[PDB]
Short mmCIF file of all heavy atoms in Angstrom, two decimals:
data_model
loop_
_atom_site.label_atom_id
_atom_site.label_comp_id
_atom_site.label_asym_id
_atom_site.label_seq_id
_atom_site.Cartn_x
_atom_site.Cartn_y
_atom_site.Cartn_z
N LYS Y 251 -7.35 -5.42 29.21
CA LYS Y 251 -7.16 -4.06 29.08
C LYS Y 251 -5.83 -3.78 28.56
O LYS Y 251 -5.44 -2.60 28.48
CB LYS Y 251 -7.48 -3.37 30.37
CG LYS Y 251 -8.96 -3.61 30.93
CD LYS Y 251 -9.30 -2.36 31.69
CE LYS Y 251 -10.49 -2.61 32.60
NZ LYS Y 251 -10.17 -3.76 33.59
N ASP Y 252 -5.09 -4.81 28.18
CA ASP Y 252 -3.69 -4.65 27.73
C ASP Y 252 -3.49 -5.57 26.53
O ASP Y 252 -3.79 -6.82 26.56
CB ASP Y 252 -2.65 -4.87 28.81
CG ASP Y 252 -1.37 -4.56 28.38
OD1 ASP Y 252 -1.15 -3.36 27.98
OD2 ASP Y 252 -0.42 -5.37 28.51
N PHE Y 253 -2.80 -5.08 25.47
CA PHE Y 253 -2.51 -5.75 24.24
C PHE Y 253 -1.89 -7.06 24.51
O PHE Y 253 -2.11 -8.13 23.90
CB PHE Y 253 -1.77 -4.88 23.22
CG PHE Y 253 -1.49 -5.53 21.90
CD1 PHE Y 253 -2.56 -5.64 21.04
CD2 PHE Y 253 -0.29 -5.94 21.55
CE1 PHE Y 253 -2.30 -6.25 19.76
CE2 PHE Y 253 -0.10 -6.62 20.24
CZ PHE Y 253 -1.02 -6.60 19.38
N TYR Y 254 -0.86 -7.04 25.48
CA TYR Y 254 0.04 -8.21 25.67
C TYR Y 254 -0.65 -9.13 26.81
O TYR Y 254 -0.01 -9.84 27.39
CB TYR Y 254 1.40 -7.75 26.12
CG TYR Y 254 1.91 -6.75 25.20
CD1 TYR Y 254 1.75 -5.31 25.37
CD2 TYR Y 254 2.64 -7.09 24.09
CE1 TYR Y 254 2.38 -4.42 24.48
CE2 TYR Y 254 3.17 -6.20 23.21
CZ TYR Y 254 3.08 -4.87 23.49
OH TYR Y 254 3.61 -3.95 22.55
N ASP Y 255 -1.96 -8.99 26.94
CA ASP Y 255 -2.70 -9.77 27.95
C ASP Y 255 -3.47 -10.89 27.33
O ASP Y 255 -3.75 -11.99 27.89
CB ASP Y 255 -3.56 -9.00 28.79
CG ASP Y 255 -2.92 -8.38 30.06
OD1 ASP Y 255 -1.63 -8.61 30.22
OD2 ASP Y 255 -3.54 -7.54 30.74
N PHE Y 256 -3.70 -10.68 25.99
CA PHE Y 256 -4.46 -11.63 25.19
C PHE Y 256 -3.66 -12.90 24.99
O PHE Y 256 -2.51 -13.04 24.95
CB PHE Y 256 -4.68 -11.02 23.85
CG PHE Y 256 -5.72 -9.89 23.69
CD1 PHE Y 256 -5.33 -8.65 23.51
CD2 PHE Y 256 -7.15 -10.23 23.89
CE1 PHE Y 256 -6.33 -7.60 23.57
CE2 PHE Y 256 -8.04 -9.34 23.89
CZ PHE Y 256 -7.71 -7.91 23.73
N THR Y 257 -4.56 -14.02 24.92
CA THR Y 257 -3.98 -15.32 24.86
C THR Y 257 -4.95 -16.11 23.83
O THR Y 257 -6.04 -15.61 23.76
CB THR Y 257 -3.94 -16.12 26.17
OG1 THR Y 257 -5.29 -15.86 26.86
CG2 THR Y 257 -2.80 -15.69 27.03
N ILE Y 258 -4.45 -17.15 23.22
CA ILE Y 258 -5.25 -17.90 22.31
C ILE Y 258 -6.56 -18.38 22.94
O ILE Y 258 -7.44 -18.97 22.30
CB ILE Y 258 -4.53 -19.14 21.74
CG1 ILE Y 258 -5.19 -19.63 20.48
CG2 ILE Y 258 -4.36 -20.22 22.81
CD1 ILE Y 258 -5.56 -18.55 19.61
N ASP Y 259 -6.66 -18.15 24.27
CA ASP Y 259 -7.93 -18.66 25.01
C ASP Y 259 -8.95 -17.55 25.29
O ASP Y 259 -9.94 -17.87 25.95
CB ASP Y 259 -7.37 -19.20 26.49
CG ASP Y 259 -6.78 -20.53 26.30
OD1 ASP Y 259 -7.16 -21.34 25.52
OD2 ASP Y 259 -5.80 -20.82 27.16
N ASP Y 260 -8.72 -16.43 24.72
CA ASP Y 260 -9.67 -15.46 24.88
C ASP Y 260 -10.38 -15.18 23.47
O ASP Y 260 -11.35 -14.43 23.40
CB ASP Y 260 -8.90 -14.03 25.02
CG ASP Y 260 -8.42 -13.87 26.46
OD1 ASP Y 260 -8.47 -14.87 27.18
OD2 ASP Y 260 -7.69 -12.89 26.85
N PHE Y 261 -10.07 -16.12 22.40
CA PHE Y 261 -10.77 -16.01 21.15
C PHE Y 261 -11.58 -17.25 20.96
O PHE Y 261 -11.04 -18.45 20.96
CB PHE Y 261 -9.75 -15.84 20.14
CG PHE Y 261 -8.90 -14.54 20.26
CD1 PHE Y 261 -7.57 -14.65 20.61
CD2 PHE Y 261 -9.55 -13.32 20.18
CE1 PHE Y 261 -6.83 -13.51 20.75
CE2 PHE Y 261 -8.72 -12.20 20.42
CZ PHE Y 261 -7.51 -12.28 20.73
N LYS Y 262 -12.87 -17.06 20.74
CA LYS Y 262 -13.76 -18.24 20.48
C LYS Y 262 -14.84 -17.85 19.35
O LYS Y 262 -15.70 -17.05 19.62
CB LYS Y 262 -14.47 -18.64 21.78
CG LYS Y 262 -14.17 -20.07 22.23
CD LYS Y 262 -15.32 -20.53 23.26
CE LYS Y 262 -16.71 -20.11 22.66
NZ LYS Y 262 -17.73 -21.09 23.09
N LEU Y 263 -14.82 -18.54 18.28
CA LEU Y 263 -15.75 -18.31 17.23
C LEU Y 263 -17.02 -19.01 17.59
O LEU Y 263 -17.05 -20.32 17.71
CB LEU Y 263 -15.23 -18.78 15.97
CG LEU Y 263 -15.67 -18.13 14.56
CD1 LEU Y 263 -15.31 -16.67 14.65
CD2 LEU Y 263 -14.98 -18.77 13.47
N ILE Y 264 -18.20 -18.43 17.74
CA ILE Y 264 -19.45 -18.98 18.11
C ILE Y 264 -20.38 -19.30 17.10
O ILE Y 264 -20.74 -18.39 16.35
CB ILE Y 264 -20.06 -18.19 19.22
CG1 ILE Y 264 -19.35 -18.41 20.60
CG2 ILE Y 264 -21.51 -18.54 19.47
CD1 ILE Y 264 -19.38 -17.26 21.58
#
Side-chain angles (χ1 to χ4, degrees):
Chain Y
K251 301 210 197 63
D252 191 53
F253 186 71
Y254 312 93
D255 271 357
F256 286 109
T257 42
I258 196 50
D259 285 325
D260 290 4
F261 305 111
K262 243 202 42 151
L263 210 58
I264 285 152

